[PDB]
Enzyme design. Structure first.
Site, PDB file in Angstrom:
ATOM      1  N   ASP A 113      -1.125 -12.826  -3.773  1.00 32.42           N
ATOM      2  CA  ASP A 113      -1.783 -13.373  -2.598  1.00 32.42           C
ATOM      3  C   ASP A 113      -2.001 -14.868  -2.816  1.00 32.42           C
ATOM      4  O   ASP A 113      -1.712 -15.378  -3.901  1.00 32.42           O
ATOM      5  CB  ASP A 113      -3.087 -12.634  -2.302  1.00 32.42           C
ATOM      6  CG  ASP A 113      -4.040 -12.664  -3.487  1.00 32.42           C
ATOM      7  OD1 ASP A 113      -4.379 -13.781  -3.941  1.00 32.42           O
ATOM      8  OD2 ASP A 113      -4.399 -11.571  -3.975  1.00 32.42           O
ATOM      9  N   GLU A 118      29.476  -8.038 -21.411  1.00 29.15           N
ATOM     10  CA  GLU A 118      28.261  -8.104 -20.615  1.00 29.15           C
ATOM     11  C   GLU A 118      27.522  -9.390 -20.964  1.00 29.15           C
ATOM     12  O   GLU A 118      26.880  -9.981 -20.101  1.00 29.15           O
ATOM     13  CB  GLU A 118      27.398  -6.863 -20.863  1.00 29.15           C
ATOM     14  CG  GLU A 118      28.012  -5.596 -20.285  1.00 29.15           C
ATOM     15  CD  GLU A 118      27.586  -4.279 -20.923  1.00 29.15           C
ATOM     16  OE1 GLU A 118      26.986  -4.285 -22.018  1.00 29.15           O
ATOM     17  OE2 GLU A 118      27.889  -3.239 -20.329  1.00 29.15           O
TER      18      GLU A 118
END
Ligand SMILES: OC[C@H]1O[C@H](O[C@@H]2[C@@H](O)[C@@H](O)O[C@H](CO)[C@@H]2O)[C@H](O)[C@@H](O)[C@H]1O
Ligand SMILES: OC[C@H]1O[C@H](O[C@@H]2[C@@H](O)[C@@H](O)O[C@H](CO)[C@@H]2O)[C@H](O)[C@@H](O)[C@H]1O
Ligand SMILES: OC[C@H]1O[C@H](O[C@@H]2[C@@H](O)[C@H](O)O[C@H](CO)[C@@H]2O)[C@H](O)[C@@H](O)[C@H]1O
Ligand SMILES: OC[C@H]1O[C@H](O[C@@H]2[C@@H](O)[C@H](O)O[C@H](CO)[C@@H]2O)[C@H](O)[C@@H](O)[C@H]1O
Lengths: 721, 721
Positions: free
Chosen positions: B528, B608
């Protein structure tokens, strides 16, 4: 009481829980009621006759009678009705007819159009015969409506006779029409696409015209010959539904028109597109059979009514209640690249897992090493099969398996001996290059020489070989119409093609009635009630993905029984979707259909083999429940749902299959309630041994638990004690 | 001109393209207009005053003036207005107040409530000060409205003074309220759940009251302190939106009430639940800051306005325009099971792939070998770290990486030395067992001794160690409120907890302003604008699934800038969803956020590793575009969409990321149009070298091509020439 009744100027067509009540008003036929049974009908819902502006009249002085505003059972153009017409015949300088009712008859027992698929097991039926005449044109139109004593369905078709001294041409001739009173309505249809067949579509009826149609020469992947006109707010469990369907596999149209007064017309029949029909003096034309089916028990009600009617009166009696063999098909397994060794090794593995039937797919005939040649050359490739087909079949039989075989009789390759010998047999237009589709052409089955040749070649194949099953394919749509000696003969060739096809398949299926014929058209490209009259199962879709199969099976079994609905466990990653799915889910999804297998069993691990053997064992048990039982949709797989669930009941057996598409997190478990159980019944769940009352399962329901992951499934199996 | 103006009985609060115009009517304050700028306001949209039944009056004889029917900027109960109140103070035998306007002032430059997060960079602002008094109760309420010269936002808060000789108790005190005229409205909110944060919700405003609220002591995973009141039919590109938001991280409520006349009230503030506030004579209470933001450019308009205001006036200046380091976090990589060797080896691999910052997650302190103990004991586990934290940090620094560290200061385990020493420091009720959550308890930050202890312990940690980054966690919500000496002190403890937290974090972030603090609360449990005042990034979600991240990122960046939005490439199968996703898609999805990595790099293949190095190289290039550029949503990932697409523009760089969830078949390719380009601009697409005008990209768009498969993605990179 059910059957047909004639009472003053009313005709009552009375099937089980469905009546059509028609009034003869001075030669005009008015639809008074279609719906639940009414005896002693008085006319509470009659049209109020008033002067409607621009709605004209058969007489000068009466402005309140207009065919623009009366509810009817067939539609003409040119007499004041401007709604879409369903009969339109050219004669002399006009295509205005004015057919007037002259006489009614009642038949009992079997009848139907010659040369077209129609209901069977009709001993307890009656047929209303409404004889109409246009005295000026010297034409007759005869309408037939047939009752059934065991189903809320009425069947319809018509015959048009040319009794004049000149040629006439039919331009429009649908099989059924009804004018329904202004109200709010929704429609359900089955559309979709290749690899997305029978997608269930629902929408509001709006002012104007909505239609689905095929101009492909086959009913097609993207539209089914069905239209459900529904009471606003219909659900699975409640509300009125009227399903209109067509027993035809060629070009069709279904439409719903909302006119200027909010009235609603629905109709289904041969598509006007690609259709005209010449009648010489004394010739007649009969339309395919349409069906109108009713339920007041929502969409599951209509599914049950439709499925029941199909099982009892369309699908072959020899197979409609016969458990279908679990098959192996080699297509996705090998494509064209196989020979005898590979075939028998696959057969060996199939036998070990308890599979019942071995189907040899494309590539066994002519020089069919790919999909660029050899269609039309139905000669055994003895080199590839390592000897005669007879010797192959014996080998398969000796391994304990029934034998099945792929055909595509309607097609011809440019590169084939057939085309080299008869290039004119292909559908084509003089002076235009071919249009190609999968690099093949369509045979002109409107040519009687083509039909004779196929009857001969195929009768030979079936009598000289011990074949248990046929897969009948059809892998493209029709282009380049121009085989007629005249334009009109070309306009007739698409329907004559269908008559040729039906002559061919009715002959072979009848002459070889022990053989199970499964229809196919790149999967579900011709999955309609015309084909299902002769072919008691269908390859529902080339899409064999467990998850993509969910909406497909939803639609494919919406109006047609589950027993028809071919479904195969296939390899991963799936060939159509490029997707990994659990073998368990592939199994459970295919087991909601007519189970088979289509992957290279010889390349599976020992574990995957054991799993399939377990699946086969399980389905041998569930097969009667799935194939012979009553189907209840519990959660529908649509565009927004993340779930699918389908229940089957059969005597003391109740099963439920649940599938979740995407993994979810921090989401409360679904509560899944069963339907159509005895409240007081006691139901023992196999997996946990717990006994639940039917009331509990129906009103509380099952908390559905899954682990984390995509494409997971589970099945609940109950035995009523 | 912008700022505040007082003109006869009108007050004009004038931000950029947004005005609030208030009228003083005999001591009552009326909301005349909130919306686009109006000068010389006459009152075209004034309330028509009439006798509304059961709407009562401040005087006997005038039935047409009623606070039940006037549009207001704060709400009282008991004076005839029955809409939900936003100020309610108990004094003597009543909680009726009657605050009347007495005087207005104008401030310039910075101001805000003491002890609560409020806007910064306020040199070019003015604040309207509306001084209200209740002469009988001897209370003052002062309302503040602040203009901004560079943003369509107005900020608001209030102060209540007790000028009486007795204790009074605040029961309700919201931060902003507006009465909007009857019209059709929709609302957008961000709700969802843990691992489903900030789910975008849209609905019609209906008669009655709709609310979102937290009573958890934190704003929470399932609701964000935001409510968007929208013109009916708003789209991404068009229509009026008013966003009300709260700079507070504790208990809040946002509500929209549609009353009996169809009028609409909206408000946001401290939740009445778990709140009361005692004021002794001369004490005062200030509310947290609310924001009202406006756009007439639809939902993308409101996103831009909100993001801009956050970047300029909330997020720390030190970081709001600073590219954030690509990090490795070891949490999903090792959980609690690590030691020095493992850490440095991971650090080695991180350095090789070009990662910038190494974050040591949970488990480094006390005897924290699992999540059942040791919270509160912020002592380095030198055994586990194989020496001092100082020596570890030096090691990480010498490998070329910044160093980051996990804390959870607000929490205490029963099994900890802290709890053994101070059991009374936990939030609890005398004579009740603890309620547990992740087997831990919450520290009472309303206790000044608790705040002092945390300032001390943490100041020590940060001054004695060369830490570049802090991840500040908070892993449960508040139960068992009863630490007050009286009931009223308990009712105050949840807000005092927040004041304690803000005192703590403002102190540390200010005293250690070079450190990047990322906030966290089991992911987005406290994401928030209160936290974002001190913590310029946030761990958006524990869900690190590339696909589940789509709706999460949609919501998490809806009102907050992308730069805030932590997103990590993690291992497969994903730990939350149990799902395999392509590494490419994990990369592209995380690159729509603030990129980091959270998997065991030491266990990846060489391939990877190369892929991740390529991803890091790419993002070093895209980082300014993503973090500093303008965001445009092109396809929203919601419940029904099968797709997501987001564009970023930054100077001569335009990028677009596209993701498809489920594989599709026989479905025409999506056409994806870009936004906010120069029609005449020339845009060179990196992948094919083609140059397209902006008009082409915006009005024709890109045919989006993908192979078969789930969870595939692609990116388009353009350079304007
Ligand atoms: O059945 C209605 C029609 O009956 C007569 O013609 C039929 C013809 O349709 C076909 O069924 O062939 C038989 C063989 O005898 C009859 O000729 C009338 O000619 C039509 O006008 C019509 O009533
Ligand atoms: O600002 C409005 C209020 O001002 C006066 O009180 C303040 C008080 O709120 C706080 O800011 O502390 C200062 C320090 O001097 C002042 O005392 C009035 O007492 C209030 O009635 C109100 O007007
Ligand atoms: O050729 C054998 C094959 O025929 C039908 O499917 C094919 C499909 O494999 C191919 O990719 O496309 C054409 C149309 O372009 C057909 O759909 C059968 O449906 C299939 O089961 C198989 O028997
Ligand atoms: O403990 C370290 C961990 O804390 C937070 O996440 C946890 C989560 O791992 C655990 O499964 O659940 C609790 C709540 O039950 C928390 O959500 C951080 O968000 C995470 O990043 C990690 O740092």
């Amino acid at each position: 009481h059910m059957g047909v009744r004639i009472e003053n100027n009313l005709f009552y067509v009375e099937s089980k829980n469905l009546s059509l009540i028609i009034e003869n008003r001075n030669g005009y036929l008015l639809l008074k009621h279609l719906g639940k049974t009414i005896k002693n009908y008085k006319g509470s819902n009659s049209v109020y006759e008033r002067d409607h502006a621009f709605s004209g009249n058969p007489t000068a002085t009466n402005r309140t009678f207009s065919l623009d505003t009366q509810r009817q059972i067939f539609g003409q153009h040119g007499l004041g009705d401007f709604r879409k017409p369903t009969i339109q015949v050219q004669h002399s300088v006009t295509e205005v007819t004015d057919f007037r009712f002259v006489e009614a008859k009642i038949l009992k027992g079997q009848n139907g159009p010659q040369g077209l698929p129609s209901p069977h097991s009709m001993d307890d039926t009656e047929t209303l015969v409404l004889m109409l005449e246009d005295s000026k044109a010297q034409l007759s139109l005869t309408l037939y409506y047939t009752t059934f004593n065991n189903d809320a369905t009425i069947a319809s078709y018509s015959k048009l006779d040319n009794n004049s001294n000149q040629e006439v041409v039919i331009h429009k001739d649908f099989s059924f029409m009804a004018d329904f009173p202004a109200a709010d309505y929704e429609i359900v249809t089955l559309q979709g696409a290749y690899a997305r067949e029978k997608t269930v579509r629902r929408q509001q009826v709006e002012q104007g015209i909505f239609s689905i149609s095929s101009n492909r020469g086959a009913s097609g992947h993207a539209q089914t010959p069905a239209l459900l006109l529904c009471e606003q707010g219909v659900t699975e469990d409640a509300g009125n539904v009227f399903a209109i369907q067509l027993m035809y596999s060629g070009n069709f149209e279904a439409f719903v028109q909302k006119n200027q007064l909010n009235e609603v017309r629905v109709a289904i029949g041969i598509n006007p597109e690609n259709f005209s029909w010449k009648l010489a003096p004394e010739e007649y034309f009969e339309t395919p059979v349409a069906l109108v089916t009713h339920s007041d028990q929502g969409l599951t009600g209509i599914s049950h009514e439709s499925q029941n009617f199909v099982l009892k009166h369309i699908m072959l009696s020899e197979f409609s209640k016969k458990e279908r063999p679990i098959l192996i098909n080699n297509w996705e397994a090998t494509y064209f690249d196989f020979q005898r060794e590979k075939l028998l090794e696959l057969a060996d593995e199939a036998k070990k897992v308890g599979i019942e039937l071995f189907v040899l797919d494309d590539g066994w005939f002519g020089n069919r090493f790919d999909d660029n040649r050899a269609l039309g050359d139905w000669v055994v490739n003895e080199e590839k099969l390592g000897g005669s087909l007879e010797s192959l079949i014996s080998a398969i039989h000796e391994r304990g398996l029934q034998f099945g075989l792929w055909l595509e009789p309607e097609m011809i390759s440019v590169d084939s001996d057939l085309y080299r010998q008869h290039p004119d047999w292909a559908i084509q237009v003089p002076g235009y290059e071919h249009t190609y589709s999968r690099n093949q052409l369509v045979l002109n089955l409107a040519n009687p020489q083509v039909v004779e040749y196929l009857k001969s070649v195929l009768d030979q194949l079936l009598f000289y070989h011990d074949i248990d099953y046929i897969k009948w394919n059809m892998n493209r749509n029709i282009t380049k119409l121009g085989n007629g000696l005249t334009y009109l003969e070309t306009q007739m060739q698409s329907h004559q093609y269908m008559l040729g096809l039906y002559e061919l398949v009715s002959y072979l299926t009848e002459k070889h009635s022990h053989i199970l014929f499964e229809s196919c058209s790149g999967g579900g490209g011709r999955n309609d009630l015309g084909m299902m009259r002769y072919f008691p199962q269908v390859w529902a879709s080339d899409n064999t993905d467990a998850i993509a199969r969910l909406p497909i099976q939803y639609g494919s079994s919406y109006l047609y029984p589950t027993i028809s609905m071919g479904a195969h466990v296939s390899a991963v990653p799936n060939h159509q979707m490029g997707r990994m799915t659990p073998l368990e889910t592939r199994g459970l999804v295919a087991m909601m259909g007519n189970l088979g297998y289509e992957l290279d069993l010889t390349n599976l691990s020992d574990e995957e083999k054991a799993t399939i053997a377990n699946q086969v064992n399980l389905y041998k048990e569930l097969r009667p429940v799935v194939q012979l039982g009553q189907q209840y949709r519990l959660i529908n797989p649509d565009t927004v749902s993340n779930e699918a669930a389908v229940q089957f009941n059969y005597g003391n057996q109740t099963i439920v299959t649940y599938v979740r598409v995407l993994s979810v997190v921090e989401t409360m478990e679904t509560t899944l309630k069963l339907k159509d159980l005895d409240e007081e019944g006691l139901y023992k769940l196999q997996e946990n041994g717990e006994v639940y009352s039917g009331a509990e399962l129906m009103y509380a329901g099952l908390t559905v638990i899954l682990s984390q992951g995509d494409f997971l499934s589970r099945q609940y199996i109950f035995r009523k004690l």
